[PDB]
C-alpha cells in the first residue's frame, strides 16, 4: 500500500487552520475502526504518535489537533496553529503487513517579519593557542528566513572563509537564526584591527554593522 | 514510564556489519511487537520490520530482508537490530518503536545515526563564545560554545544540563572544506544576570565517547 501525502509543505500564519490529507492505494477501514495514524517529528526528535486509528488523539495530546476519514481519504486539522506545531506530519497505515509511511507534509509558519538582532565574538583565547581564529557573527530571531551577511576585514570585503548556518524555525516564536563564522589563522587574525559582520534583512531599512577591534 | 534507549551513534565501515540495540523498560517486553524504522538524512520515515518478542517471529519490508537481522533477547528485555555489509544507502538514523497490537507505534526510542564511512572518529575542540559589549542587544546578552572538529555527526549540545532551555539555538552542522564538521549552541540571556548567573555548555559526541562541560564567562 502507498500512501501519498498532499500537500509537500503547508504554510499558515499562526492560529489559522492547517489540514493535511493522506490517500491510501486501497481501502484501510473496516466497519468498526480506520488503520491510518498519524505522527509528528520535531526538529532533532523521533517521531511522536499524534492520531491513532483516524481520529482517536493519544493521550497528552492537545485538543486543536484532530483527524478524519475513512476509506481511503484522510485528514489530520489542526484548528489553530501555534509556534511548536512546526514539524513534519507522517501518515502511517496498519492494515496489513508491511505497514508503510506516507512522503510527510512540512509544516511551515508564517509569522510577522522580525529584524534579526547581531552579535559578534571574537575568537577565544583558548582557540588561540592552538593556531587557528573563528570569529562568529549571530544573527538572532529573525523572519523571514532571507538575510545577508559579509564580512569586513579591515574595511575589506572578504570571500572565501566563512560558513553559515541556519535554524529551523523555533518551537516557541517561529524566527529563524543564522550564524557566520569566519576562520583565519592566527596569524592572520593578528594582522588586523577591525573585525566586522553586515547584515541585511528586509525587517531593517539599511545594513547593520558590529565589529570589534582586536587588542 | 515507557522507554526505549538506544545504542550510540557511530561510524561503520564499508562492507562491515553493525549491531544496535534498543533497551526497554516501563512494561512488560515480551507484550509488545518491537519495530524498526529507518530514516535517511533529510528523508521521510521507512519501515524495516518487526519481531515479536514472546515467538521470535519476524516480517520485513522487502527492501531489507537481506540486510537486517532481528532478534531479542527476553531476560535482558532489549531487542537487537543487525545490519549487515554497510553501503552509503545505508547512513540513516535507525528507530526502534513499540507496536501497541501491532498496529500504531506508541514509543520511540531517541535514534541511533549509523554513518557508513572509511573515515576515522575525531572528537571536538569546544570553546566559549563569552559574551561581552559586542554581543550585547536591547538589555540582553548572547553567549555560546563552539563545537569544532569532528566526525561523524551528531554532537548534541545542552546548557546548564537541561536547566536552560529557553533562547538556545543550537546550529545544524556545517561541513568544513577538511572533512570534519563543526557547530556552535548560543543562547540570549539578560544582560543583567552575567555577574549573578552561571552558564555551563555541555557537549556530547557519542561516537567518540567525547563529554566536555565548558564554563562561558563573561570576557
Known sequence: ?215 | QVQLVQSGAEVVKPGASVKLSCKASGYIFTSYYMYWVKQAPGQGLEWIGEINPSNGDTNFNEKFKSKATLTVDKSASTAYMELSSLRSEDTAVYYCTRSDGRNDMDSWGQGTLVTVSSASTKGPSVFPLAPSSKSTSGGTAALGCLVKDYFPEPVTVSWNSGALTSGVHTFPAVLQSSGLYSLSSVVTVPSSSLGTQTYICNVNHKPSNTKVDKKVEPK
Open chain 1, 1 to 215: 500500500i502507498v500512501l501519498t501525502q498532499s500537500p509537500a509543505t503547508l504554510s499558515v500564519s499562526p492560529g489559522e487552520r492547517a489540514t493535511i490529507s493522506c490517500r491510501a492505494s486501497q481501502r484501510v477501514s473496516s466497519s468498526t475502526y480506520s488503520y491510518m495514524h498519524w505522527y509528528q517529528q520535531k526538529p532533532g526528535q523521533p517521531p511522536k504518535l499524534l492520531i491513532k486509528y483516524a481520529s482517536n488523539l493519544e493521550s497528552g495530546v492537545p485538543a486543536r489537533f484532530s483527524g478524519s476519514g475513512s476509506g481511503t481519504d484522510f485528514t489530520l486539522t489542526i484548528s489553530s496553529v501555534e509556534p511548536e506545531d512546526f514539524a513534519t506530519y507522517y501518515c502511517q497505515h496498519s492494515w496489513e503487513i508491511p505497514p508503510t509511511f506516507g512522503g510527510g507534509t512540512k509544516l511551515e509558519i508564517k509569522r510577522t517579519v522580525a529584524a534579526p538582532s547581531v552579535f559578534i565574538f571574537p575568537p577565544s583565547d583558548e582557540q588561540l593557542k592552538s593556531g587557528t581564529a573563528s570569529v562568529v557573527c549571530l544573527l538572532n530571531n529573525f523572519y523571514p528566513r532571507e538575510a545577508k551577511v559579509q564580512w569586513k576585514v579591515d574595511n575589506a570585503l572578504q570571500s572565501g572563509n566563512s560558513q553559515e548556518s541556519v535554524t529551523e524555525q523555533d518551537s516557541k516564536d517561529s524566527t529563524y537564526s543564522l550564524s557566520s563564522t569566519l576562520t583565519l589563522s592566527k596569524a592572520d587574525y593578528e594582522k588586523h584591527k577591525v573585525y566586522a559582520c553586515e547584515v541585511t534583512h528586509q525587517g531593517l531599512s539599511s545594513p547593520v554593522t558590529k565589529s570589534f577591534n582586536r587588542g
